[PDB]
Motif scaffolding. Structure first.
Motif, PDB file in Angstrom:
ATOM      1  N   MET J  17       0.792  -1.224   0.000  1.00  0.00           N
ATOM      2  CA  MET J  17       0.000   0.000   0.000  1.00  0.00           C
ATOM      3  C   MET J  17       0.834   1.290   0.000  1.00  0.00           C
ATOM      4  O   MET J  17       0.425   2.246  -0.671  1.00  0.00           O
ATOM      5  N   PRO J  18       1.993   1.397   0.673  1.00  0.00           N
ATOM      6  CA  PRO J  18       2.825   2.595   0.443  1.00  0.00           C
ATOM      7  C   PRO J  18       3.652   2.570  -0.833  1.00  0.00           C
ATOM      8  O   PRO J  18       4.581   3.378  -0.953  1.00  0.00           O
ATOM      9  N   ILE J  19       3.383   1.663  -1.771  1.00  0.00           N
ATOM     10  CA  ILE J  19       3.868   1.867  -3.133  1.00  0.00           C
ATOM     11  C   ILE J  19       2.705   2.268  -4.033  1.00  0.00           C
ATOM     12  O   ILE J  19       2.869   3.059  -4.969  1.00  0.00           O
ATOM     13  N   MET J  20       1.513   1.736  -3.745  1.00  0.00           N
ATOM     14  CA  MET J  20       0.312   2.122  -4.477  1.00  0.00           C
ATOM     15  C   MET J  20      -0.014   3.594  -4.259  1.00  0.00           C
ATOM     16  O   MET J  20      -0.322   4.321  -5.208  1.00  0.00           O
ATOM     17  N   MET J  21       0.068   4.057  -3.009  1.00  0.00           N
ATOM     18  CA  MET J  21      -0.165   5.470  -2.733  1.00  0.00           C
ATOM     19  C   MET J  21       1.030   6.342  -3.075  1.00  0.00           C
ATOM     20  O   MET J  21       0.916   7.570  -3.007  1.00  0.00           O
TER      21      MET J  21
END
Ligand SMILES: CCCCCCCCCCCCCCCCCC(=O)OC[C@H](COP(=O)([O-])OCC(O)COP(=O)([O-])OC[C@@H](COC(=O)CCCCCCCCCCCCCCCCC)OC(=O)CCCCCCCCCCCCCCCCC)OC(=O)CCCCCCCCCCCCCCCCC
Ligand SMILES: CCCCCCCCCCCCCCCCCC(=O)OC[C@H](COP(=O)(O)OCCN)OC(=O)CCCCCCCCCCCCCCCCC
Lengths: 114, 49, 173, 458, 167, 91, 68, 86, 51, 551, 53
Positions: J17-21
């Protein structure tokens, strides 16, 4: 071990008039800095030390070349050399490997792959 | 004008697809096969030829 | 789903209870709370689609083929009947890949279900599977004519060597 | 092909028919529209087989290979416009028309339905490539390289005609690959050596052995406007695939003399990549990468029995997308510094930050980082030729070692600084420079999800 | 390299390689004049081999026992974190192409940019005029006259005059 | 002699060639290139129908096991494809 | 006070780029996203066994999927 | 993170004059030129900064010898090297 | 809050990733492949006893 | 029971998720390390919940998720594994990485390139964690070479500095020599066993495993820094500090031995295997011992001590103790990620020296971290009652009764004595002497980002093994016999170095002006191996044998 | 065959001099010299094979 590398020697006075070899490189640097500073250049300088480095390495080896020696005929110990040896190995396998595969068995029942 | 230079040229697709159909309507040799591929009794293996 | 005879497993046989102490156990705090937090957004939504998906239905059928010709037909210069004998044949080799996939997953079934002993128990898999793979590369795998897949031009002729060499030339069998 | 050739010939009276500078936007617009239609009827099923229409198509059934041939005319026009826009419009209309005229014959090639329809289309090229080599290059050694590109390809391909006409009146007729059900075997003789050898050697001259690769760093080194036929000449090299059509059948039982083609192309593999780490011309650095792991397929075709055709097909379009983009990385960054000398382009990675990712994700496909289309290709070749003899893991393993030190040597030459010069090199990699550098990795890592589309029969 | 400063470049390192060998602080400092005492033996004499035997035998006992991985003064030609400030590296004059709404920021720095260029764009009528005169033909190192006799502008202008600051 | 232009970037932005309708050259390469082909065409073969007729074979190998496994038919025969139709010439 | 002015080379073109990827990818991606969402809810396939298809079977659409 | 000014470099150079017992606090402040009482050849050219070899001592190359005669010329280019005052 | 930042991160995918799990063990002919109970005596959900 | 892995896949999915965001979906008011630091902060507590579910009843779960391509007979899709190394190692390794970012929030406090370093560290964890969860040898090879390319992008963090990215070139070089053994044993498994799913390999134990496992041993020496490939580590430390705090404490050097740990149901037989492994483990002990002495960097001293811990752990496979081997890493991972970060406060405190010279004593306003230094360096003495006493003592007294080389115990137990003079050396130069360093003492220690960092790990250090070894299933029969004059000297092995280092260090301080005698053979504090071979092997191939059969 | 073994880019204070900063005409043989250096302390005494002995 590669190499010595000769970081101190003697002088004074073996050929003391050898100076102003710096006058060559100061001439080049006075040529270069006057070339490098200018208000409108927008592009590299030629600097043909690179041009003579590629063109004397890319071309100008085969117009140079004559087969007058045997150290350029040395390449039959290097070109066709090891390629002889790889044939000698690979037909001893796939023949000794072959006879064991036909006469007798070596692999098990669960060898579908292969 | 109406730009025949433009999209009128990809309209050669259906023009090419018209000639695409004319071969299979003379390649109508066999309704006789055995692997479904039947043309047994039905109006299924007759159609789309 | 499926049928359990194809994919077997023994019952569950799961022990239980065993507290025996008044020492503070956190298992009563864990399963008695968090199961309800997931029960609302999952079970209510899955049921909501389940009626919405039961609004209308769609159909797709079994696809069974016709097998009139089999193997040794036909004469050499024919094309047509020797096309059908390859259309027969290639379906009898894509399928026989996957029957090895089924029996291999059966071997995966026992070993993660027992794990500890795993060798002296289940009694069946290492006997069944190696009587199927040893019945695979003989006569059904063109080793090494597997490149062109050689339908009926070589699939019979391993099995010619399984008749012309085998069973008579053993001297004297 | 029902009509894929019939719209793509209709592209040709659109270019000259157009107005002024609109000729770039009119051609690239419609050329993308075939990519739906190319996909459209093709990729059908699928179990023995898809004979397509007639004597003109077997639909390229088990080897797709043809969708990639149709990206390129809407990939090269956006690439070639960098230094082409100083000539006349009358010649700018020419260079688009012969490029389409190269795509026309490749479309009836790869499908071709026959073996004699193949050859006349196998040789129907090399006339529109040679026009792009001789005209539209740079300073000289174009003209000898225009002759080294001939006389290897044409000296070898003429003994095809002696052998293919020989088959056509010996055993029935070759006209179909599906009349190849009746095949007599080819035993050990003194005439059946040459029937095997002449039919094979004309394919070796395009996908090179270690010998006779002498034309490959000639045409690619001295090369058109921005890799403009160099993208085509990498497809054309892997468009000599037809050994997969021939040698699977049609003398199937001659492995007896495969060995001077194995050892020459298996030891040459470990050397011809090793001979490139001292290159000083940047476009000749890539030109030897294209020798090495293309020649891995030559030991993957002659060794039969798939789990190799799983991988030998995936390697033809492995660096179909990789080695195309590496040429595009070098067709760019030459518009700004006018030398291809790899020494000179230092002081970089600060000036152009957005294209640092385009260097790495190129060079991370030779390291090949297993979930790509690359190490799903090599690791089927590795697990294939292991089962030939166990000793082949050594040479092919050292192949994996040296190309790791080889690919990074092109990356790490840009991670330096202070730049010393260069009042030029300002242009911050414009919108076109990233667009034609994209659409390479965007299908390359996409197909790694379901790469069942990239497989032989197999 | 004159014989006057031949010992001096060896004299700086003779104590420098010594302090990497000590463990205390006074251990170096008690050995200070003690190391100077052998260096103070030959004080004032000739310049020939009469005094070159100070140096011709200084190869032993200096190179013999020379600095087993010495101290390196980390901002130096060698040593860790010497040329490390390079992710920034100060790319000076990268401000040519902007396509503005990116030239909105720093309105005063771009104001001051066009002011300094007059010394850069106009100094060639003066500096290059004497440059053919002050340099006779091909002589040694090309520094100008150190005020350039009216106003040194610079000659090194502006790449050595406005060069990259470290941070 | 020699005349070559520079950074086709006269402060203006520029995409391909020049100011106007060459501005439209981006929205004919961005919109046609990806976002219709690399999205909808990428969607096309995502769920494309039964490829190489394997989905047929999945259920058909699933069914045919337990029928043979039930009563009398063994598994993985390789039975020479109905023998005694082979005459088998000895020598 | 401790203060200077940093020098960053060029960022406007890279911010003028990276939009056109992310803009147009939603322009037909997100309308295709409902087509994988809404068509799942209302349309499926069922089931097995068999049917006997009457006398003549169905045409193409033997598959078990909404859009396939 | 710590900054620096130019009032500290004027003191440390001046202090190690007083730290040396060879030199009294009666010589001039910025320009005694070293020769005033500098002696002799060696050890009055490199030893004069051997105290700052430990303190500042950023490897102080071979050019730094004969510029250091003028004792203000030492103070000149230390500000050039270590990115100092404005 | 610690209210909308924390609840958006973790609580939403566990609803998602469970839905592809309970609807999945009855579809695929092998679910998670759990081992046995490793019992000494005998009770639990059976009846068998031991000494 | 259905929530056994349902909460575990939460751990393997949340970190994405902190690569998607990071692809700009209306990002936070910026502070971007705080977004990731709190992202791990809830991922730890989810992972610990099925660890308690395992220690009750077991019920290990592999899964069957989603199909890749499937070819002729072998199907590979992907799966996971949850047996004794997933439900144990994962919260341990993730608890360190929770603790290590706060340091880099202050260590990388000034860098404008901040966000990549909290992104590349995130991708490094995912492809590290996909390795231990995999039951598929293909899925291992993804995570085997995902972690390798993450080194090149982290040793070469700083551009320029032509020794930095040359070391990154040496970093990826020895991994590819470390590759060639692994792909060898990958090939041998298809040709015999038709697959490489780790279940079916353990069904029938293969008879003659002489061919694949020597390849598995050579790939084990690729990343785990054995002899013959040893010079990769001491020059890989040239990057930033929390890189090497993560690169060589918990990751990337315990992964090389981890592959052999998973293959315990094969390695117990075949006596050619065990004697080569345990003799390999002994050589790495004293060669890293006699190289670390008279060495002048803090980080290099830690770089050899992390290599000499391997020299025990390689022997732990030779003597058939699989779980005692793995139990060492669970203790060891809390050591140096503390200790790099402990000394990382010191290098910034003098703003740079990282030299064991020019330091002074302990308390020059350094109260807290010197107290943290004397715990772990007392743990590294050999564990009187500290953390890894249940890992260290139980293995050297598992080599008590053994069929070893009899030169192996003459190489393992002697190396334990050399570990003691590791301790007081950094005491006697950085924590003992008179304050000597150039002036303007600019020390500072009061940033609560660092104080929150150390205070969590030091508490977790002490009570680690007394919870882990107290709550664990025993799998083997212990020794529990140790007779007279043969039993407890392994402590006195460690005691003698306290006398021996001081009476030489005081002889270096307390002696008789033993002027540093030049006359000394010191080809032990250099290795004399990188000096000759990295001047010969890059010159032999790249100059002669390349200009031979090129042009 | 000019004098060789390594422009190590040390102090080099004339200007660019060595390998970074590009002097005018000093290229002798290269591509092995942007990664090869100078002489060490002692000499060969191959104790490394004696160490494994
Ligand atoms: C507010 C918004 C408005 C509302 C929006 C709508 C609500 C959300 C939509 C609902 C969810 C749909 C999203 C699709 C992705 C997830 C699907 C899934 O997990 O279940 C699989 C599910 C399977 O359905 P099924 O009924 O279970 O089984 C049918 C098949 O037989 C199953 O087998 P198969 O044939 O599909 O084979 C499996 C494999 C096969 O597919 C492929 O491999 C094709 C991909 C590579 C193509 C290479 C060829 C190119 C030449 O599929 C995959 O690759 C799965 C990877 C993820 C999808 C790949 C996307 C393709 C690009 O769906 C699909 O596989 C189809 C995916 C289609 C993609 C649609 C494009 C979505 C783009 C959205 C962009 C959003 C951007 C937001 C910005 C964020 C900023 C931070
Ligand atoms: C070298 C030249 C030597 C060629 C000798 C000709 C071989 C030959 O005789 O052909 C053999 C055979 C047909 O000939 P035949 O023996 O009459 O068949 C029996 C008919 N009942 O079968 C054939 O038809 C073979 C015909 C194709 C082979 C002709 C080409 C052979 C030479 C190609 C060598 C490879 C390329 C080298 C040349 C390029 C470089 C210059």
């Amino acid at each position: 071990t590669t190499l010595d590398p000769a970081e101190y020697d003697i002088s004074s006075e073996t050929r003391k008039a050898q100076a102003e070899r710096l006058a060559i490189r100061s001439r080049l640097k006075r040529e270069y800095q006057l070339q490098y500073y200018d208000p409108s250049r927008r592009g590299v300088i030629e600097d043909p030390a690179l041009v003579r480095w590629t063109y004397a390495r890319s071309a100008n080896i085969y117009p140079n070349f004559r087969p007058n020696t045997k150290t350029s005929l040395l390449g039959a110990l290097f070109g066709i050399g090891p390629l002889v040896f790889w044939y000698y190995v690979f037909k001893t396998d796939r023949d000794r490997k072959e006879k064991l595969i036909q006469e007798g068995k070596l692999d098990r029942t669960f060898n579908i792959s292969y | 004008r109406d730009h025949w230079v433009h999209v009128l040229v990809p309209m050669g697709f259906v023009f090419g697809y018209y000639l695409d159909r004319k071969n299979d309507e003379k390649l109508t040799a066999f309704r006789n096969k055995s692997l479904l591929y039947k043309r047994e009794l039905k109006p299924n293996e007759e159609v789309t030829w | 789903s499926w049928d359990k005879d194809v994919y077997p497993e023994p019952p569950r046989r799961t022990p239980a209870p065993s507290p025996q102490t008044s020492l503070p156990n956190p298992i009563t705090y864990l399963t008695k709370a968090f199961d309800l937090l997931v029960d609302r957004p999952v079970t209510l939504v899955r049921e909501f689609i389940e009626r919405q998906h039961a609004k209308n239905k769609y159909y797709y059928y079994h696809r069974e083929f016709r097998r009139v010709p089999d193997i040794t037909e036909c004469q050499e210069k024919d094309v047509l009947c020797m096309f059908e004998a390859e259309m027969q044949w290639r379906r009898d080799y894509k399928v026989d890949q996957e029957i090895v996939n089924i029996i291999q997953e059966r071997l995966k079934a026992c070993q993660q279900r027992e794990g500890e002993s795993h060798r002296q128990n289940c009694a069946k898999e290492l006997e069944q599977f190696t009587q199927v793979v040893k019945a695979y590369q003989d006569r059904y795998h063109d080793l090494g004519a597997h490149y062109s897949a050689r339908k009926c031009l070589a699939k019979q002729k391993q099995r010619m060597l399984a008749e012309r060499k085998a069973a008579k030339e053993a001297a004297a069998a | 092909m029902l009509k894929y050739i019939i719209p793509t010939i209709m592209l040709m009276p659109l270019t000259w028919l157009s107005k002024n500078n609109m000729i770039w936007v009119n051609s690239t617009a419609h050329s993308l529209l075939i990519s739906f239609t190319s996909l459209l009827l093709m990729n059908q099923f699928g179990d023995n087989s898809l004979n397509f229409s007639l004597l003109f198509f077997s639909d390229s059934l088990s080897t797709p290979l043809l969708i990639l041939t149709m990206w390129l005319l809407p990939l090269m026009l956006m690439a070639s416009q960098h230094h082409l826009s100083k000539e006349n419009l009358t010649r700018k209309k020419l260079f688009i028309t012969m490029l389409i005229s190269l795509q026309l014959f490749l479309i009836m090639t790869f499908t071709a339905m026959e073996l004699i329809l193949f050859y006349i289309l196998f040789e129907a090229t090399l006339v529109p490539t040679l026009i792009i080599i001789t005209r539209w290059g740079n300073q000289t050694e174009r003209l000898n390289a225009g002759l080294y590109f001939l006389f290897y390809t044409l000296a070898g391909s003429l003994p095809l005609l002696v052998a293919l006409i020989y088959i056509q009146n010996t055993v029935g007729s070759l006209n179909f690959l599906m009349l190849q059900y009746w095949v007599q075997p080819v035993h050990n003789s003194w005439s059946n050596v040459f029937m095997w050898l002449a039919c094979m050697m004309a394919f070796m001259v395009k996908m090179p052995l270690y010998g006779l690769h002498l034309w490959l760093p000639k045409a690619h080194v001295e090369a058109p406007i921005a890799g403009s036929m160099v993208l085509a000449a990498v497809l054309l090299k892997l468009g000599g695939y037809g050994m997969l059509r021939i040698t699977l059948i049609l003398n199937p039982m001659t492995d007896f003399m495969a060995y001077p083609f194995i050892m020459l192309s298996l030891w040459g593999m470990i050397m011809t990549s090793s001979i490139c780490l001292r290159q000083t011309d940047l476009k000749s650095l890539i030109a030897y990468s294209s020798v090495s792991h293309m020649a891995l397929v030559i030991v993957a075709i002659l060794i039969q029995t798939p789990w190799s055709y799983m991988g030998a097909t995936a390697l033809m379009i492995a660096h179909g997308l990789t080695s195309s983009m590496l040429f595009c990385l070098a067709n760019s960054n030459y518009e700004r510094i006018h030398s291809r000398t790899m020494i000179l382009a230092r002081g970089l990675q600060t000036l152009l930050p957005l294209m640092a990712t385009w260097w790495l994700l190129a060079s991370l496909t030779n390291l090949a980082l297993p979930p790509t289309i690359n190490l799903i290709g090599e690791l089927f070749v590795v697990m294939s030729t292991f089962s030939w003899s166990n000793i082949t893991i050594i040479l092919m393993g050292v192949n994996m070692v040296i190309t790791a030190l080889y690919s990074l040597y092109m990356l790490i030459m840009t991670q330096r600084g202070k730049y010393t010069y260069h009042i030029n090199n300002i242009s911050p990699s414009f919108t076109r420079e990233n667009a034609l550098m994209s659409l390479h990795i965007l299908p390359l890592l996409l197909l790694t999800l379901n790469p069942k589309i990239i497989l032989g029969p197999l | 390299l004159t014989h006057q400063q031949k010992v001096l470049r060896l004299y700086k390192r003779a104590l420098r390689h010594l302090e990497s060998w000590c463990i205390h602080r006074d251990k170096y400092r008690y050995f200070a004049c003690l190391l100077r005492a052998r260096f103070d033996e030959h004080k004032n004499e000739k310049d020939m081999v009469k005094a070159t035997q100070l140096l011709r035998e200084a190869e032993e006992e200096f190179w013999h026992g020379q600095h087993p991985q010495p101290y390196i003064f980390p901002e130096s030609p060698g040593g860790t974190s010497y040329e490390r400030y390079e992710c920034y590296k100060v790319p000076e004059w990268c401000l040519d192409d902007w396509h503005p709404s990116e030239k909105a920021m720093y309105p005063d720095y771009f104001a001051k940019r066009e002011q300094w260029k007059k010394l850069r764009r106009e100094s060639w009528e003066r500096e290059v005029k004497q440059l053919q005169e002050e340099t006779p033909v091909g002589g040694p190192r090309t520094e100008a006259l150190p005020p350039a006799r009216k106003q040194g502008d610079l000659p090194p202008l502006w790449w050595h005059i406005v060069t990259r600051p470290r941070e | 002699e020699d005349e070559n232009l520079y950074e086709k970037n006269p402060d203006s932005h520029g995409y391909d060639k020049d100011p106007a309708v060459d501005i439209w050259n981006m929205r004919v390469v961005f919109f046609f290139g990806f976002s219709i082909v690399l999205v909808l065409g990428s969607t096309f073969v995502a769920y494309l129908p039964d490829y190489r007729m394997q989905e047929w074979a999945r259920r058909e190998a699933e069914r045919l096991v337990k029928y043979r496994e039930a009563h009398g038919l063994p598994i993985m025969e390789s039975n020479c494809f109905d023998p005694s139709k082979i005459q088998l010439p000895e020598d | 006070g401790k203060r200077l002015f940093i020098i960053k080379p060029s960022g406007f073109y890279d911010k003028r780029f990276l939009k056109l990827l992310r803009f147009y990818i939603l322009l037909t991606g997100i309308p295709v996203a409902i087509g994988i969402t809404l068509i799942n809810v209302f349309i499926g396939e069922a089931e097995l066994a068999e049917i006997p298809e009457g006398y003549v079977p169905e045409h193409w659409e033997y598959f078990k999927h909404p859009i396939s | 993170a710590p900054p620096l000014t130019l009032e500290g470099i004027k003191d440390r150079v001046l202090y190690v004059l007083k730290l040396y017992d060879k030199i009294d606090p009666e010589k001039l402040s910025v320009n005694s030129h070293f020769m005033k009482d500098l002696g002799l050849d060696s050890l009055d050219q490199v030893e004069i900064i051997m105290a700052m070899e430990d303190e500042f001592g950023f490897e102080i190359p071979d050019i730094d010898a004969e510029k250091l005669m003028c004792p203000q010329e030492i103070v000149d280019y230390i500000a050039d090297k270590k990115d100092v005052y404005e | 809050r610690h209210s909308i930042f924390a609840f958006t991160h973790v609580l939403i995918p566990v609803w998602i990733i469970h839905y592809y799990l309970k609807y999945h063990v009855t579809t695929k002919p092998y679910t998670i492949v759990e081992k046995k109970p490793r019992i000494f005596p005998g009770d639990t959900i059976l009846e068998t006893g031991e000494v | 029971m259905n929530m056994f892995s349902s909460l575990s896949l939460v751990t393997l999915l949340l970190l994405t998720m902190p690569i998607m965001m990071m692809s700009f979906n209306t990002y936070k008011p910026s502070n971007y390390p705080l977004y990731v630091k709190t992202a791990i902060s809830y991922a730890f507590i989810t992972s610990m919940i099925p660890t308690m579910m395992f220690i009750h009843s077991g019920q290990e779960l592999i899964i069957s998720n989603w199909h890749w391509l499937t070819i002729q007979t072998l199907k590979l899709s992907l799966s996971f594994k949850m047996d004794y190394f997933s439900m144990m190692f994962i919260p341990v390794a993730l608890f360190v990485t929770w603790s290590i970012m706060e340091f880099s929030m202050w260590y990388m406090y000034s860098d404008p390139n901040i966000n990549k370093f909290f992104k590349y560290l995130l991708l490094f964890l995912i492809t590290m964690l996909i390795l231990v969860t995999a039951n598929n040898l293909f899925q291992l090879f993804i995570g085997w070479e995902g972690v390798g390319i993450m080194s090149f992008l982290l040793i070469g963090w700083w551009y320029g500095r032509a020794d930095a990215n040359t070391a990154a070139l040496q970093a990826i070089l020895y991994n590819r020599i470390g590759d060639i053994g692994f792909i060898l044993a990958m090939a041998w498994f298809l040709t015999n066993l038709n697959t490489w799913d780790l279940q079916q390999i353990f069904m029938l134990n293969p008879s003659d495993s002489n061919m694949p496992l020597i390849g598995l041993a050579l790939a084990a020496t690729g990343k785990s820094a054995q002899f013959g490939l040893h010079p990769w580590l001491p020059s890989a430390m040239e990057g930033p500090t929390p890189v090497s705090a993560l690169l060589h404490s918990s990751t990337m050097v315990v992964a090389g031995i981890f592959l052999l740990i998973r293959f315990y149901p094969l390695t117990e037989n075949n006596k050619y295997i065990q004697s080569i492994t345990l003799c390999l483990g002994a050589i790495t002990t004293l060669f890293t011992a006699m190289c670390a002495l008279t060495q002048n960097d803090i980080k290099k001293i830690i770089a050899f001590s992390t290599s000499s811990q391997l020299g025990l752990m390689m022997v732990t496979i030779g003597i058939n103790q699989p779980y005692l081997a793995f139990l060492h890493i669970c203790t060891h991972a809390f050591f140096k990620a503390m200790l790099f970060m402990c000394s990382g406060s010191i290098i910034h405190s003098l703003n740079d020296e990282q030299d064991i010279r020019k330091m002074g004593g302990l308390f020059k306003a350094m109260p807290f971290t010197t107290t943290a230094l004397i715990v772990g360096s007392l743990a590294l003495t050999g564990m009187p009652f500290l953390t890894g006493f249940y890992s260290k003592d139980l293995i050297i007294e598992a080599a008590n009764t053994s069929y070893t080389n009899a030169w192996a115990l003459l190489m393992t137990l002697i190396a334990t004595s050399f570990t003691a003079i590791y301790s007081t050396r950094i005491i006697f130069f950085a924590l003992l002497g008179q304050p000597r360093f150039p002036t303007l003492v600019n020390i500072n220690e009061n940033n609560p980002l660092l104080i929150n960092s150390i205070k969590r790990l030091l508490i977790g250090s002490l009570f680690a093994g007394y919870i882990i070894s107290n709550n664990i299933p025993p799998t083997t029969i212990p020794q529990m016999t140790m007779p007279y004059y043969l039993k407890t000297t392994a402590l006195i092995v460690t005691i003698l170095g306290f006398i021996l280092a001081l009476e030489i260090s005081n002889m270096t301080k307390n002696l008789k002006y033993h002027y540093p005698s030049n006359a000394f053979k010191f080809s032990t504090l250099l290795g004399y191996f990188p000096t000759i071979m990295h001047r010969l092997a890059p010159y032999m191939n790249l100059s002669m044998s390349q200009k031979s059969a090129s042009s | 065959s000019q004098q060789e073994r390594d422009p190590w880019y040390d102090w080099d204070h004339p200007d660019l001099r060595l390998n970074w900063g590009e002097p005018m005409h000093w290229d002798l043989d290269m591509y092995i010299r942007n990664r090869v250096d100078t002489s060490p302390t002692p000499v060969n005494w191959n104790l490394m094979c004696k160490h494994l002995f």
